[PDB]
Amino acid sequence: SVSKANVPKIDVSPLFGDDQAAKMRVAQQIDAASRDTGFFYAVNHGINVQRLSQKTKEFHMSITPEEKWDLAIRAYNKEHQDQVRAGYYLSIPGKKAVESFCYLNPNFTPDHPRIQAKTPTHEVNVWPDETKHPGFQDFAEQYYWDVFGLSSALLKGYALALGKEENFFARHFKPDDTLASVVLIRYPYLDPYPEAAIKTAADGTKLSFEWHEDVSLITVLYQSNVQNLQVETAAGYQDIEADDTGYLINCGSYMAHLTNNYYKAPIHRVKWVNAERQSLPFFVNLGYDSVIDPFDPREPNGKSDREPLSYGDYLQNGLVSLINKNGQT
Numbered sequence: 001s002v003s004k005a006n007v008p009k010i011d012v013s014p015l016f017g018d019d020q021a022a023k024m025r026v027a028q029q030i031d032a033a034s035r036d037t038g039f040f041y042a043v044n045h046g047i048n049v050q051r052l053s054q055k056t057k058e059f060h061m062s063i064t065p066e067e068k069w070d071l072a073i074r075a076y077n078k079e080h081q082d083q084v085r086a087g088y089y090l091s092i093p094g095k096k097a098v099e100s101f102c103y104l105n106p107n108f109t110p111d112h113p114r115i116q117a118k119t120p121t122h123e124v125n126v127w128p129d130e131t132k133h134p135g136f137q138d139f140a141e142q143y144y145w146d147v148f149g150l151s152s153a154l155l156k157g158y159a160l161a162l163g164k165e166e167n168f169f170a171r172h173f174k175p176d177d178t179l180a181s182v183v184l185i186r187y188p189y190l191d192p193y194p195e196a197a198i199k200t201a202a203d204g205t206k207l208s209f210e211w212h213e214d215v216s217l218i219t220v221l222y223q224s225n226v227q228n229l230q231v232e233t234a235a236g237y238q239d240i241e242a243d244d245t246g247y248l249i250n251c252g253s254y255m256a257h258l259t260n261n262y263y264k265a266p267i268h269r270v271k272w273v274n275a276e277r278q279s280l281p282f283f284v285n286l287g288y289d290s291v292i293d294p295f296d297p298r299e300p301n302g303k304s305d306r307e308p309l310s311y312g313d314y315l316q317n318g319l320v321s322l323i324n325k326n327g328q329t
């Protein structure tokens with residue numbers, strides 16, 4: 001069998017308040033989990049995840065093939081050259097099971113200075129017709145801000161955990177310019193499930209998505225109650241239990257770079273499971289020009305032999321690399 005990964009449940013509610021000592025005790029828990037398997041569940045987070053799941057299901061189960069082409073990213077529809085990140089990511093029956101919808105900062109409007117400058121990684125979201133999907137856009141935009149709020153609180157815990165002031169990361173995570181994204185991923189139940197949509201790991205495990213490190217500062221994930229994730233540890237790949245009441249949190253490779261691998265970006269993969277389920281990540285990305293000077297909390301002077309990297313450079317190249325490694329989603 002496969003061993004269960006150590007993934008503690010951390011009550012993150014003090015990170016929304018002003019009890020500094022209580023916040024330090026949460027930071028310690030974040031530190032411990034980040035130094036161990038690299039994963040934890042954030043609980044007492046204040047977000048209505050049952051309603052998120054319900055609204056997402058209503059969207060996934062009612063969108064039609066016509067609407068998917070009309071919302072498609074450039075990888076599926078050559079007419080949409082501006083849609084690299086935001087839009088619909090189609091399934092390919094018989095070959096690719098997964099499908100999803102990605103959206104960015106709602107403040108990336110046509111008049112936004114980065115949209116006017118045509119800066120890479122910034123795009124204006126595309127949405128289905130309101131009459132076909134009543135309330136969806138409004139729900140989705142509000143969800144972006146609710147999960148942004150949780151992510152800001154989490155970033156205060158990570159900063160304190162690293163011996164910094166609580167705004168160390170959060171000062172670079174702002175509503176007017178964050179490159180953060182929400183992805184509403186549908187993993188379907190299929191009968192027969194196409195073998196071409198099932199990958200096989202070197203250890204024989206059937207997968208839907210191969211091993212990788214995340215392209216993010218941190219990743220804030222809701223998933224249905226169907227076990228699927230595995231994390232590589234010193235004892236090998238271990239199963240991460242599902243918890244559809246909490247948010248699964250881990251660091252991405254920007255955090256590993258900034259901390260000189262004190263907080264590693266854990267390697268993880270997605271097992272193949274023949275079940276209708278949801279995987280709804282929020283990728284906590286900073287602004288395009290955000291630069292955090294690398295440091296090392298294991299070194300007496302805190303210095304590291306790594307060079308500063310702008311978040312926009314990191315992101316554009318990371319997303320392309322992930323597609324080259326693990327395939328177009």
Ligand SMILES: CC(C)[C@@H](NC(=O)[C@H](CS)NC(=O)CCC[C@H](N)C(=O)O)C(=O)O
Nearest residue numbers: 085102181185209214221270279281283329
């Ligand atoms: C592991 C889950 C987070 C999920 N995987 C994922 O979402 C995988 C690996 S973290 N992520 C990506 O492909 C990056 C999507 C980036 C997004 N188009 C954007 O422009 O910002 C899954 O369930 O497969």
Ligand SMILES: [Fe+3]
Nearest residue numbers: 212213214268
């Ligand atoms: Fe990941």
